[PDB]
């Protein structure tokens, strides 16, 4: 060989390896992180991302009166003046009135432990289970997986059960319990960085995904107020708004208002999510975090730091200022904070972009108030759902843009009314900001999920399960309502999702029917619990070995196995194998007898019924084995013993066929 | 200048760039971290 081609092949190997290494650098520095699941519980009756979308799209204000079931002396802790200990001038704020509600029995927690358990831990457990279920992952099957749990939380002072009271109130447990109840093995870290806590955690989660330390991660936050201390003490300096509405970027901005909530995201690398065939909702492209540093007091924002973190997040995402279509601004509603944030957004985003595509600025806090540590992650959920619906929801309580900042540039505009999101020439992109009181800023950039058959199996079983019969009925009713608002979904896809992507619990039920006219009524009958023809119900046994019974004479009828010969290929193959093994000492073909073709002997003759029954029974047993039901034993009955022997491995197919055929002939 | 020696320069550039990229990967994943400063206050009169 000439030296030219000899060195050319080496050059080809070298440049291919160089391309591989460069791609590895690209995916190790900044890989896109897929948000494969989300869950949230927010004020205003929100308990899912769809609920949050319904709230924001309708422009509903979730601010409401204080809770009365928490032992608060709500009548005796309101006075108008802004300077008094133990008193506040705020009437209303966001709340989770079902914060104490918790399904203790589901997670194996006794009632006494649950009473001495922080509400944050309970809410985080429920939200994490919901997020895993919404991601297409069975939460039970995640046991032993290298899944991280990064959670933003704070010590809110919630306080035979002496042991439970210790681990039931430590903030470090707030993430750890999630990885203990579910059995996860990735790192569990509880972040605490004030309002930036959750979003910061998400950034850390992305790093944990990029280094390979995790295959999946939970990034989220939780905020609960067991006591009104956040309202009485913080109101001394007129920090809260009088009416309790977080007027974001409005001239009437005269303070903020607190709110409870919880929001988690099950996040995985985009390549890994694509490999496993997971549904990608959005894609965190890049993130950045820094600190205000030197500023006019510890609790005061700095526009330069916000510009820096926005630019750093854009650079990490590899996206321009003009590439982002909208931003979920922090928007605390404070008089001093809002102009600073507006100036930062104008300097960073609205500097070089077309005049006809201004940056749309919104704020979830206008709807639900300042959700606290859980705010930032909750923000992206909004910016995910809008990104799914292509509609930017309006920000409430904006009589006009605030005059402190100058909107003369026109590059940044508030979402006074809903604006349709264009879906042309590029993926939809957005940003979320979670600027914190302690000074730690955080900015996240989201991008629209990238754009991504088999024949329908007949009579696909629809499986349902639950811990208790009431939970099973609730599951059936919820599935019926969900399917009602759906334009003719594929039944096989629903069957696969129910069978694979859901945990099998104790109390089980099934719906098997070949037509899509009885499934709805059957689901209803299960919901109210009345019986139905195609409905099956039962209680699974935790332990027990399986047995295959092989009865002898009696179980014969004309045309048996005729339909399986056409529909089922495995049954046809097994019948063909039995036919080949049986042809030696038999003067007819089994397939003709089963199909009932002309001239074949009927089942009245003794010498043919036992071979046919043996072959059908063996084929059915092997079909059961093909579906994963491997017997732990076998039992026969007269001639069926022969068939049982063939399944026991005692006799080969040829030997069993010989025995049954010659014994029947004798 | 013939191709047999012309391609050698490209191969040398390619392998140098490959070594640089591999060094970048190793630095990005497992670079050691130097402890340049230390401080502690612990029981028993410890202050350094």
């Amino acid at each position, epitope marked *: 060989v000439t030296d030219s081609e*000899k*060195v050319a092949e080496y050059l080809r*190997r070298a440049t291919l*390896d160089l391309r*591989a290494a460069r791609q590895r650098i690209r995916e190790l520095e900044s890989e896109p992180i897929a948000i494969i699941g989300m869950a949230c519980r927010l004020p205003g009756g929100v308990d899912s991302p769809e609920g949050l979308w319904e709230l924001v799209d309708s422009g509903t204000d979730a601010i409401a009166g204080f809770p009365l079931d928490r032992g608060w002396d709500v009548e005796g802790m309101y006075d108008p003046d802004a300077e008094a200990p133990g008193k506040t001038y705020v009437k209303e704020a966001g709340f989770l009135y079902d914060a104490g509600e918790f399904d203790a029995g589901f997670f194996g927690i006794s009632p006494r432990e649950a009473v001495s358990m922080d509400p944050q831990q309970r809410l985080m457990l429920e939200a994490s289970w919901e997020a895993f279920e919404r991601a297409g992952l069975d939460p039970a099957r995640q046991r032993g997986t290298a899944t991280g749990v990064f959670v933003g939380a704070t010590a809110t002072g919630y306080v035979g059960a002496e042991g439970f009271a210790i681990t039931g109130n430590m903030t470090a447990v707030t993430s750890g319990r999630i990885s203990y109840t579910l059995g996860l093995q990735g790192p569990a870290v509880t972040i605490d960085t004030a309002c930036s806590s959750s979003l910061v955690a998400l950034h850390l989660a992305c790093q944990s995904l990029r280094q390979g330390e995790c295959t999946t991660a939970l990034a989220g936050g939780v905020t609960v107020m067991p006591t009104p201390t956040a309202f009485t003490e913080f109101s001394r300096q007129r920090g809260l708004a009088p009416d309790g509405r977080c007027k974001s970027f409005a001239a009437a901005a005269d303070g903020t208002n607190w709110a409870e909530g919880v929001a988690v995201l099950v996040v995985e690398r985009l390549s890994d999510a694509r490999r496993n065939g997971h549904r990608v909702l959005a894609v965190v492209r890049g993130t950045a975090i820094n600190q205000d540093g030197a500023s006019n007091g510890l609790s005061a924002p700095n526009d330069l730091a916000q510009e820096r973190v926005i630019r750093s997040a854009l650079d990490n995402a590899g996206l321009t200022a003009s590439d982002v279509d909208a931003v979920e601004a922090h928007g605390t509603g404070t008089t001093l904070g809002d102009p600073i944030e507006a100036q930062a957004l104008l300097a960073a985003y609205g500097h070089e972009r077309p005049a006809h595509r201004p940056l749309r600025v919104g704020s979830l806090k206008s709807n639900i108030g300042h959700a606290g540590p859980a705010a930032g992650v909750a923000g992206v959920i909004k910016m995910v759902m809008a990104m799914r619906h292509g509609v930017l929801p309006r920000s409430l309580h904006i009589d006009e843009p605030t005059p402190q900042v100058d909107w003369s540039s026109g590059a940044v505009t508030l979402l006074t009314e809903p604006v349709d999101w264009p879906d042309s020439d590029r993926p939809r992109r957005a940003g979320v900001s979670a600027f914190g009181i302690s000074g730690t800023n955080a900015h996240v950039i989201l991008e629209q999920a990238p754009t991504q058959p088999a024949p329908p199996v007949p009579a696909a079983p629809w499986l349902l399960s639950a811990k208790t019969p009431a939970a099973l009925r609730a599951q059936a009713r919820r599935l019926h309502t969900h399917l009602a608002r759906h334009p003719h979904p594929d039944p096989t896809d629903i069957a696969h999702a129910l069978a694979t992507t859901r945990t099998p619990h104790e109390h089980r039920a099934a719906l098997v029917t070949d037509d899509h006219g009885t499934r709805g009524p059957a689901l209803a009958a299960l919901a109210e619990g009345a019986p139905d023809a195609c409905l099956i119900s039962g209680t699974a046994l935790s332990k027990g070995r399986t047995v295959f019974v092989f009865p002898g004479q009696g179980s014969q009828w004309t045309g048996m196995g005729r339909e399986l010969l056409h529909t089922s290929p495995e049954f046809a193959a097994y019948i063909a194998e039995c036919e080949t093994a049986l042809n030696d000492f038999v003067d007819w073909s089994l397939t003709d007898v089963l199909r009932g073709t002309e001239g074949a002997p009927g089942y009245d003759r003794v010498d043919v019924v036992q071979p046919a029954l043996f072959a059908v029974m063996v084929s059915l047993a092997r079909l059961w084995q093909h579906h994963g039901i491997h017997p732990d034993a076998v039992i026969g009955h007269s001639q069926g013993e022969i068939a049982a022997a063939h399944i026991a491995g005692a006799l080969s197919l040829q030997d069993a066929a010989r025995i049954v055929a010659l014994r029947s002939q004798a | 200048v013939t191709d047999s020696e012309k391609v*050698a320069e490209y191969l040398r550039r390619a392998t140098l760039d490959l070594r640089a990229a591999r060094q970048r990967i190793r630095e990005l994943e497992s670079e050691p971290i130097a402890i340049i400063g230390m401080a502690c206050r612990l029981p028993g009169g410890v202050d350094s």
Partner: antibody
Amino acid sequence: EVQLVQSGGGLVQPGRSLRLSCTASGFTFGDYAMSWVRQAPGKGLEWVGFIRSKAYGGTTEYAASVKGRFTISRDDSKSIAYLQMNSLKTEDTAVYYCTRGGTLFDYWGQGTLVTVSS
Amino acid sequence: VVMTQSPLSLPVTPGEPASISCRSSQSLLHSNGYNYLDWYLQKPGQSPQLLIYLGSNRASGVPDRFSGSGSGTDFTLKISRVEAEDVGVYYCMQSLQTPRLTFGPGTKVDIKR
């Protein structure tokens, strides 16, 4: 994702012809020069032959032990490499590997066991 | 004609460093400042794969344990971690002179005890 799949093995009596096919996917087949390398049972690898890319001319070279008896061709349209053996001898019993590269066997097929005996 | 030879066998325990040396009968350093030499691995029962090329450049997809070194007539393949997967036959195979009749006797590697 480079992949090479071999086929055409099986038993053959001595003094007869056989064909081994190597189908390649996941890369530009025309650019590379394909090669065949055999390994007898227990013994080390022995380079059978190779074929250049069509750009260089598509010519072939073979080892002395199989010169004339063996031939190599390549269909670039469907991206397959063919090894046509003629007049197999008892010494030709071996596992044959299809590899990418005339002098740098960076990628290898899964191998095909060709056994010849009367 | 050039000729390369290595140790016939080399026991290894999982964890220690290992080094398969081999020397040539001629200086393989080409005029273009390259060592026209390759290192291939054949695992037991699997097809051979390329470990190292041009003396020291490691191929993509190989674990970073392997590292080639040496020049002129002498060469070595050094391994940091040994595992049950790394057992097999290692061939150091020259490319300065062609055609290559055979890879060579190789270097059997087996678990140590």
